[PDB]
Amino acid sequence: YVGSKTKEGVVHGVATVAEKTKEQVTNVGGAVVTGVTAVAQKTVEGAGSIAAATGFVKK
Amino acid sequence: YVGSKTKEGVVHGVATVAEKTKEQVTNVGGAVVTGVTAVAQKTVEGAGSIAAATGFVKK
Amino acid sequence: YVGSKTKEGVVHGVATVAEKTKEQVTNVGGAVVTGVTAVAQKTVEGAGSIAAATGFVKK
Amino acid sequence: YVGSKTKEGVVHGVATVAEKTKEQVTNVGGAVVTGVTAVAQKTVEGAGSIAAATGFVKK
Amino acid sequence: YVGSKTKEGVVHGVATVAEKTKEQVTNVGGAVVTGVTAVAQKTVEGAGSIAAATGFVKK
Amino acid sequence: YVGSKTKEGVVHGVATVAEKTKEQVTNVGGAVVTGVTAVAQKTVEGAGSIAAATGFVKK
Amino acid sequence: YVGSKTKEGVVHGVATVAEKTKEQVTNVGGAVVTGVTAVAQKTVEGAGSIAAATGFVKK
């Protein structure tokens, strides 16, 4: 017998509740990111980014 | 016998509830990202990005 | 016997409820992304992006 | 015996409920994306993008 | 017998509740990131970043 | 103006998911009740009972 | 103006997920009740009972 269970980058038992949650954003140049719940990813090469915000990259 | 279970980049047991949740965004140049729940991905090459916001890339 | 179960980039047990959830967006140049629930993807080459917002790329 | 189950980029058990959910968008140049629920894809080459918004690419 | 369970970059038993939680952001150039709950990822090469904010990278 | 909204005995926003849920019952005299999800009733006189089990009423 | 909202015996925002949940019952005289999720009722006279189990009422 051989058994090799293996999980990587996983999110499984999640329960969320929200009520009467007002929210307001006002962007005037640049970036905004809000409310990123229960995500998972796996990337082998390249950059792996979750909810990343940059302002204007000017050159 | 051989058994090799393997999961990568997974989101499975998820339950969410929201009620009377007002929300308001006002973009005037740039970027906004909001409300990204329960996502998963797997990318082998290239950049893997989830809910990423940049302002104007000017050159 | 050999058995090799393998899942990658999966989202399966998901239940969501929302009620009386007002929402308002006002874009005046740039980009907005909102409400991206329960998605999954797998990309082998190239960039893999989920709910990504850039303002005007000007050159 | 050999059995090789394999799923990639899958979304299967999903149940969503929404009620009296008003929503309003006002684009005046640029892009808006809203409400992208329960999607899955697999792309082998090329970029794979789900709910991506750019403003005017001007050159 | 051999069994090699192995999990890396995992978030599984999570329950969150929020109520009457007002929030307000006002970006005027630069970047804002807010509300990043219960995420996990695994990246083998490249930089792995979760909820990272830079202002305008100017050159 | 008069407005009198009134609800009694109501169940409305409900989403359930179940998978690979084996179940087995073996009654040999008496009663069994199982799996009673999302029900509502209103009774003005008489007894109101939901998922009630008695063994043999012998006299 | 008059407005009299009134709810009694209500269950509305509910989301449940269950997976690989084996279950087994073995009654040999008497009663069993199992799995009674998200129910509501209103009874004005008479007894109101939800998921009540008695063994044999013998006389």
Added chain:
Amino acid sequence: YVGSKTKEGVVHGVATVAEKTKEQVTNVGGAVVTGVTAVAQKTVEGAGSIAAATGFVKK
């Protein structure tokens, strides 16, 4: 203006997750009640009982 909101016997924002939860009951005379989640009721006269178990009432 008059407004009289009034709720009695209510259960509304509920999210539950369960996985690989084995369960086994063995009644041999008497009563068993198990798993009574998220219920609400309102009874004006008569006894109001939720998940009540008696053995054999013998006389």
Added chain:
Amino acid sequence: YVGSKTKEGVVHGVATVAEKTKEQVTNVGGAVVTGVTAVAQKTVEGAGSIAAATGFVKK
């Protein structure tokens, strides 16, 4: 202006997670009650009881 909000016997913001929770009951005469989560009721006359267990009432 008059406003009289009033709630009685209410359970609203609830999130529960359980995993690999084995359970076993063995009744041989008498009563068992188990697992009564997130319930609410209101009774005006009569006895109000939640998850009450008596053995055999013999006379």
Added chain:
Amino acid sequence: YVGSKTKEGVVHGVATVAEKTKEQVTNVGGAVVTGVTAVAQKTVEGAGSIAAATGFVKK
């Protein structure tokens, strides 16, 4: 202006997590009650009891 908020017998912000919690009961006459989480009730007359266990009331 008059405002008279009033809550009685309420349980609202609750989040519970349990994992690999084995449990075993063995009743051989009498009563057992176990696991009564997050309940609320209001009773005006009559006795109000939550998770009460008596053995055989014999006369």
